[PDB]
Amino acid sequence: XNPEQXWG
Amino acid sequence: AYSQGGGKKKVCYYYDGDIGNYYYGQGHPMKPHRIRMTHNLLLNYGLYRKMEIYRPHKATAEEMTKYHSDEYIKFLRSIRPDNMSEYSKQMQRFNVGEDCPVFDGLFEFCQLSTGGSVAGAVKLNRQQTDMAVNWAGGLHHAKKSEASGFCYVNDIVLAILELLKYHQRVLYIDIDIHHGDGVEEAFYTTDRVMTVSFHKYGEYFPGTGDLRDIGAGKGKYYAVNFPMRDGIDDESYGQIFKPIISKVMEMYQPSAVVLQCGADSLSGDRLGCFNLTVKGHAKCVEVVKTFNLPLLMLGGGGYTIRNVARCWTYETAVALDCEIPNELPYNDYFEYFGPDFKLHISPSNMTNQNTPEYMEKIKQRLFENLRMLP
Ligand code: NA
Ligand code: NA
Ligand SMILES: [Zn+2]
């Protein structure tokens, strides 16, 4: 859920 | 026998002064400091005079293993930044080390977040309060044997398991912008817990929550998902929240309610793409409040922390039926609330991609499934 990092 | 369901409700509020010191890491959007900002703000509003404030206990590994696996809880008990190298395999197995990092006091933070939710459930079970509030709770993404979406231990599932000792049917409502997958997954095959989640859906974490997901087995038609698009506002949200919850209350008739009040559905959230104001967000609390059922209010998402403090402060006042002025009182974090220093926020100019016909169409399909209840 974090757009700045990963796929979350 | 003269009761009519109204009146001011008894509110018990759970907060540990150590919760604000836990730190997810540099640049991580989840900031437990928002809970301390919330507490300090409502203290300066004087809301401590209208409710009972409790410090929750640190929930034990035995309490957490009522849902979570022994191995996963044992890992959370043991993992520390100074021994991460030796746990490189188990970190990937339990989805820890990226979105859900290892930080100092991780297990203690889980104990405090979970302790408030289970203590509030016990208080409600003992019929010693109308509402229990744990803004450190609401970590709805945690799975039985893995962390997810900044959540490690699912305080909601544990609190609902506590409520199920004395309540036949428990209703869970999730207004976090993300789908409450961890709660829905835990109770997907039982009709004793009905989960209702409103969330942005489509190229968005966690990728679940399709409206065609309605439960399985005895739990079929006891999972309700309202998928939404970017930029929903107060009017669109309010036009479908009350009618859907009203129909759920009529068909399901629960004896206890758990409301996850995730604040990342507010306008301007660092991770969210909704356009709700604090008043529009808080109207959900008022609607659930009216049905006069034992209610556990939890926190959750929220990553523009000044708006998170505004939202959970106002919704505590709503639970207390206390009108508080728009002018923010002075507090330990006054500078966070510039340049206006007001309690309420205004929406953005973003486009509401949820057309009124879309909202009515989704609502009508959910009413079909709600007709399938006995
Ligand atoms: Na949600
Ligand atoms: Na269910
Ligand atoms: Zn969220």
Author numbering:
A (entry chain F): 500 to 507
B (entry chain A): 6 to 379
Tell me, in the authors' exact words, what the paper reports:
To address this challenge, we develop a computational “anchor extension” methodology for targeting protein interfaces by extending a peptide chain around a non-canonical amino acid residue anchor. To test our approach using a well characterized model system, we design cyclic peptides that inhibit histone deacetylases 2 and 6 (HDAC2 and HDAC6) with enhanced potency compared to the original anchor (IC50 values of 9.1 and 4.4 nM for the best binders compared to 5.4 and 0.6 µM for the anchor, respectively). SHA can coordinate to the zinc ion in the active site of HDACs.
Our first computational method (design method 1) started with docking structured cyclic-peptide scaffolds onto SHA and re-designing the residues in the interface to improve binding. Tens of thousands of conformers were generated for each of the 100 peptides, their energies were evaluated, and those designs for which the designed target structure had the lowest energy were selected for downstream analysis. From the previous pool, five peptides with the greatest in silico predicted affinities were tested for HDAC2 inhibition in vitro, the best of which (des1.1.0) demonstrated an IC50 value of 289 nM. The crystal structure of this design in complex with HDAC2 revealed two distinct binding modes and peptide conformations in the three protein chains of the asymmetric unit, suggesting flexibility of the peptide as well as presence of iso-energetic binding conformations. Rosetta-guided mutational scanning successfully stabilized the binding mode observed in the crystal structure (confirmed by structures of variants Lys4→Glu and Pro3→hydroxy-Pro) but failed to significantly improve affinity or selectivity.
